[PDB]
Structure formats: structure tokens, C-alpha cells
Design an enzyme around this catalytic site. Sequence first.
Site, PDB file in Angstrom:
ATOM      1  N   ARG A   1       0.875  -1.179   0.000  1.00  0.00           N
ATOM      2  CA  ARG A   1       0.000   0.000   0.000  1.00  0.00           C
ATOM      3  C   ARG A   1       0.912   1.228   0.000  1.00  0.00           C
ATOM      4  O   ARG A   1       1.660   1.418   0.942  1.00  0.00           O
ATOM      5  CB  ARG A   1      -0.914  -0.034   1.248  1.00  0.00           C
ATOM      6  CG  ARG A   1      -1.899   1.103   1.358  1.00  0.00           C
ATOM      7  CD  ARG A   1      -2.913   0.846   2.463  1.00  0.00           C
ATOM      8  NE  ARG A   1      -3.794   2.008   2.630  1.00  0.00           N
ATOM      9  CZ  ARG A   1      -4.081   2.588   3.788  1.00  0.00           C
ATOM     10  NH1 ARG A   1      -3.594   2.098   4.924  1.00  0.00           N
ATOM     11  NH2 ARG A   1      -4.902   3.629   3.829  1.00  0.00           N
TER      12      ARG A   1
ATOM     13  N   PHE B   1       1.942  10.865   1.015  1.00  0.00           N
ATOM     14  CA  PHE B   1       1.454  10.357   2.277  1.00  0.00           C
ATOM     15  C   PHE B   1       2.450   9.403   2.903  1.00  0.00           C
ATOM     16  O   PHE B   1       3.203   9.815   3.784  1.00  0.00           O
ATOM     17  CB  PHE B   1       0.039   9.754   2.142  1.00  0.00           C
ATOM     18  CG  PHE B   1      -0.555   9.197   3.402  1.00  0.00           C
ATOM     19  CD1 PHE B   1      -0.100   9.613   4.655  1.00  0.00           C
ATOM     20  CD2 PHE B   1      -1.627   8.315   3.350  1.00  0.00           C
ATOM     21  CE1 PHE B   1      -0.640   9.075   5.824  1.00  0.00           C
ATOM     22  CE2 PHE B   1      -2.170   7.792   4.522  1.00  0.00           C
ATOM     23  CZ  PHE B   1      -1.697   8.203   5.743  1.00  0.00           C
TER      24      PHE B   1
ATOM     25  N   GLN C   1       3.653   1.779   2.799  1.00  0.00           N
ATOM     26  CA  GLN C   1       3.337   0.747   3.797  1.00  0.00           C
ATOM     27  C   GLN C   1       3.805  -0.653   3.380  1.00  0.00           C
ATOM     28  O   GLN C   1       3.663  -1.031   2.233  1.00  0.00           O
ATOM     29  CB  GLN C   1       1.834   0.727   4.058  1.00  0.00           C
ATOM     30  CG  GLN C   1       1.459  -0.137   5.240  1.00  0.00           C
ATOM     31  CD  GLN C   1      -0.012  -0.082   5.515  1.00  0.00           C
ATOM     32  OE1 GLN C   1      -0.675   0.905   5.207  1.00  0.00           O
ATOM     33  NE2 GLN C   1      -0.559  -1.131   6.144  1.00  0.00           N
TER      34      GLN C   1
ATOM     35  N   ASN D   1      -1.548  -0.436  12.209  1.00  0.00           N
ATOM     36  CA  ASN D   1      -2.304  -1.224  13.180  1.00  0.00           C
ATOM     37  C   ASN D   1      -3.782  -1.294  12.738  1.00  0.00           C
ATOM     38  O   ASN D   1      -4.158  -0.677  11.738  1.00  0.00           O
ATOM     39  CB  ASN D   1      -2.161  -0.602  14.599  1.00  0.00           C
ATOM     40  CG  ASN D   1      -2.689   0.801  14.724  1.00  0.00           C
ATOM     41  OD1 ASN D   1      -3.829   1.114  14.323  1.00  0.00           O
ATOM     42  ND2 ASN D   1      -1.879   1.682  15.324  1.00  0.00           N
TER      43      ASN D   1
ATOM     44  N   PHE E   1       5.040   1.701   8.251  1.00  0.00           N
ATOM     45  CA  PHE E   1       5.035   2.635   7.147  1.00  0.00           C
ATOM     46  C   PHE E   1       6.116   3.646   7.333  1.00  0.00           C
ATOM     47  O   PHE E   1       6.547   3.917   8.458  1.00  0.00           O
ATOM     48  CB  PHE E   1       3.667   3.336   6.960  1.00  0.00           C
ATOM     49  CG  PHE E   1       3.144   4.082   8.165  1.00  0.00           C
ATOM     50  CD1 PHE E   1       2.491   3.400   9.193  1.00  0.00           C
ATOM     51  CD2 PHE E   1       3.136   5.469   8.188  1.00  0.00           C
ATOM     52  CE1 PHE E   1       1.984   4.090  10.291  1.00  0.00           C
ATOM     53  CE2 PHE E   1       2.607   6.166   9.270  1.00  0.00           C
ATOM     54  CZ  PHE E   1       2.028   5.473  10.318  1.00  0.00           C
TER      55      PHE E   1
ATOM     56  N   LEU F   1      -1.888  11.161  12.905  1.00  0.00           N
ATOM     57  CA  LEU F   1      -1.556   9.806  13.343  1.00  0.00           C
ATOM     58  C   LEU F   1      -0.886   9.830  14.717  1.00  0.00           C
ATOM     59  O   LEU F   1      -0.753   8.780  15.350  1.00  0.00           O
ATOM     60  CB  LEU F   1      -0.677   9.093  12.290  1.00  0.00           C
ATOM     61  CG  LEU F   1      -1.279   8.994  10.854  1.00  0.00           C
ATOM     62  CD1 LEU F   1      -0.303   8.384   9.897  1.00  0.00           C
ATOM     63  CD2 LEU F   1      -2.580   8.185  10.845  1.00  0.00           C
TER      64      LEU F   1
ATOM     65  N   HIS G   1      -0.611   5.860  16.154  1.00  0.00           N
ATOM     66  CA  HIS G   1       0.401   4.961  15.604  1.00  0.00           C
ATOM     67  C   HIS G   1       1.695   5.200  16.355  1.00  0.00           C
ATOM     68  O   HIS G   1       2.064   6.349  16.600  1.00  0.00           O
ATOM     69  CB  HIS G   1       0.556   5.192  14.082  1.00  0.00           C
ATOM     70  CG  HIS G   1      -0.692   4.817  13.344  1.00  0.00           C
ATOM     71  ND1 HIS G   1      -0.850   3.554  12.805  1.00  0.00           N
ATOM     72  CD2 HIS G   1      -1.840   5.517  13.155  1.00  0.00           C
ATOM     73  CE1 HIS G   1      -2.070   3.534  12.276  1.00  0.00           C
ATOM     74  NE2 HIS G   1      -2.722   4.667  12.509  1.00  0.00           N
TER      75      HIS G   1
HETATM   76  O1  LIG Z   1      -3.399  -0.206   6.915  1.00  0.00           O
HETATM   77  C1  LIG Z   1      -3.352  -0.012   8.127  1.00  0.00           C
HETATM   78  N1  LIG Z   1      -3.984  -0.810   9.006  1.00  0.00           N
HETATM   79  C2  LIG Z   1      -4.762  -1.977   8.586  1.00  0.00           C
HETATM   80  C3  LIG Z   1      -4.228  -3.217   9.260  1.00  0.00           C
HETATM   81  C4  LIG Z   1      -2.910  -3.256   9.730  1.00  0.00           C
HETATM   82  C5  LIG Z   1      -2.454  -4.421  10.350  1.00  0.00           C
HETATM   83  C6  LIG Z   1      -3.318  -5.513  10.464  1.00  0.00           C
HETATM   84  C7  LIG Z   1      -4.613  -5.407   9.954  1.00  0.00           C
HETATM   85  N2  LIG Z   1      -5.027  -4.277   9.393  1.00  0.00           N
HETATM   86  C8  LIG Z   1      -2.587   1.129   8.701  1.00  0.00           C
HETATM   87  O2  LIG Z   1      -2.504   1.276   9.909  1.00  0.00           O
HETATM   88  N3  LIG Z   1      -1.987   1.985   7.853  1.00  0.00           N
HETATM   89  C9  LIG Z   1      -1.227   3.134   8.344  1.00  0.00           C
HETATM   90  C10 LIG Z   1      -0.488   3.702   7.127  1.00  0.00           C
HETATM   91  C11 LIG Z   1      -1.060   5.115   6.930  1.00  0.00           C
HETATM   92  C12 LIG Z   1      -2.448   5.104   7.603  1.00  0.00           C
HETATM   93  C13 LIG Z   1      -2.179   4.239   8.845  1.00  0.00           C
END
Ligand SMILES: O=C(NCc1ccccn1)C(=O)NC1CCCC1
Length: 164
Positions: free
Chosen positions: A54, A59, A62, A101, A112, A121, A125
Amino acid sequence: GNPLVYLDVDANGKPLGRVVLELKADVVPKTAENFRALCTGEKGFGYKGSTFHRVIPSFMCQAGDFTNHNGTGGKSIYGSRFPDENFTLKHVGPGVLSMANAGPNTNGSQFFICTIKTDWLDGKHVVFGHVIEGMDVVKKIESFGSKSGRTSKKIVITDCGQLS
Ligand SMILES: O=C(NCc1ccccn1)C(=O)NC1CCCC1
């Protein structure tokens, strides 16, 4: 001192170079230790071979889902998930390394690297390090993202480990 770790990244099977990260073990020892061991792979699992799944331009980039390779998975060296250690370090700007998370106390292996200041955040985070070298590599990764987060090139962490 604080650990220095590396990520060697390919885009469509050709090397982009290396991202070097300082892990702030002095502030978040448990979060830094988890990331350090997943880089070396010393627990028999880790980031080697996993992807940046991602990526959103202006931004962040990830990665870290080495179990499902799609953003739903990953695991820590402690068990499936571990608590938010603290929110002392802030998402101050480009190069901040922070834990992804699924809400409070759900840190696993996904992380990320920001490409901008992401102040919203803070307190949500856990920030645990920053880019020492390789922001050029991070900008390349970022350029292969999209508004939806879908990558236009396959971004793979080919090799990773600990420098010091
Ligand atoms: O994509 C994210 N969380 C979904 C997730 C993470 C682990 C297990 C299950 N689901 C997540 O925190 N992205 C962060 C990158 C920028 C926005 C915040």
C-alpha cells in the site's frame, strides 16, 4: 546505541537501492526490538521477500505483511499482536518510521515510512524510528503508488538486516 537496520528494495525485479533506518530503542525498546529481529529474520520469519503493498503519493509507503502479503496479516516476535508501547515520538515529517495497526494495541509487523508530516496519526500509531539514508529510494517507492494505495510496480524487500 540505537540499532541501524536496512531494507534493500526492488521495483519489478530491479534494485532501487537501500533504505537505512535508525530504530529508537531508547524511547520504544519493545517496538524497536520487534522491527530489528524481523529485519534479521533471526526468529525464523521476517520481512525478507515481503512487499510494500500500500503506497499513497504525498502520504506514506506501507509494508510488513509477510504472512498474507495484502495488508491483513503479519505477526510480531512476541505473538500475533503487541501493545502500543507509547506515543512519545511524533509523525514530524518525511522519513518517520511508524507502526501500522487495526486500532489500539494491535501492532504486528506492518509499518510505514511517511513522505510528509502526518500529525493526525500522533497518539494512534507508535513512531519508532526514521530514515538515516535512502530517502531517494523512498521517493521512488512513493512514485509507484496511487490514491487508492494500489502499486503500479511490484515493490519487494529483497534483503534486510542489521548494520549495527
Ligand atoms: O493499513 C493499516 N492498518 C490496517 C491493518 C494493519 C495491520 C493488520 C490489519 N489491518 C494502517 O494502519 N496503515 C497506516 C499507514 C497510513 C495510515 C495508517
